[PDB]
Amino acid sequence: ALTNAQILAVIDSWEETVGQFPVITHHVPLGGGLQGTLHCYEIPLAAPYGVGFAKNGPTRWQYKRTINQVVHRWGSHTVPFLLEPDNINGKTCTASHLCHNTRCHNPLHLCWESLDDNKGRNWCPGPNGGCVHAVVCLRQGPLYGPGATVAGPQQRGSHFVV
């Protein structure tokens, strides 16, 4: 809600609840042929999810609190960043999963960045494979690799140059 104290209280209540979510160990590629371990705090698959939480989509949740007798509601991963600018360079800031695990609500696995930066981590080589993200990746992106291109650039005639 409006006050800084109220916002800090929301963040603190969210942290306490998410901190009681099951902790699931995930072994992940780091790049460079190395492996690491992440501890994700995973929201349950079905209700009940935890105090203040409700599912608005297959992998979307919201956090809700009643403050000045009115309901305030946020996307469930946005709560750690309520005191941060909500835009950057005119682009909306989004909660971005460094662990590439939507159910995870561990704030140590989240950052706050443009949707383009967010998406791009899917292809990052990872913290031991050449990640250049200033806020470093925790793992190699799940889509990193050679791809599966069906056909490359080609022409039948002689009209084009690269």
Next chain:
Amino acid sequence: ALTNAQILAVIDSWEETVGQFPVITHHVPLGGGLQGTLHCYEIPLAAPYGVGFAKNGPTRWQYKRTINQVVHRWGSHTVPFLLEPDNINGKTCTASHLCHNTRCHNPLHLCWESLDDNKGRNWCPGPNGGCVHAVVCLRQGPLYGPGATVAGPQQRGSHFVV
């Protein structure tokens, strides 16, 4: 259904027409601090675009030919790939700009791959910066770099470990 010969004739007429689009020389990052040059064949900003071409969206076009009294229409960048499989690993194939220049219709700047592979090229370090795409990038992706993350992973209490 169109025969192989008919499809080849469509590809040939498309190439003939695109080969008359204005050819624009662009200097581009290749990765590794090297610069290179790409020659894009750019569809005009407004009508007329060229024989067979029409705009269906701000940066979307279609190619249309009438064969034996039947109107056939294709996405304007899909025509080079009409003799290729239209799916791979259960995913639809998409025309993918290696030059990242949507108006360009140079078939030497296009490949045919899943939408995920297509998107991921936006963040690739480039052919001289570590590209691992099996069908190699022509340039560093426009969104490659450290990013502009507003806030990194953080907690107020001690409920979490990474």
Next chain:
DNA sequence: TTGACTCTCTTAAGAGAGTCA
């Protein structure tokens, strides 16, 4: 047969808000 417009849809990373009990 052709040009120049019109409309909505797909995907996978993300969102806001309303209806009930």
Next chain:
DNA sequence: TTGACTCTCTTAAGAGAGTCA
């Protein structure tokens, strides 16, 4: 007040199809 559902929207890489003369 809190929980458990419902709906549609945003973005930027991509699509299909209709109307009229």
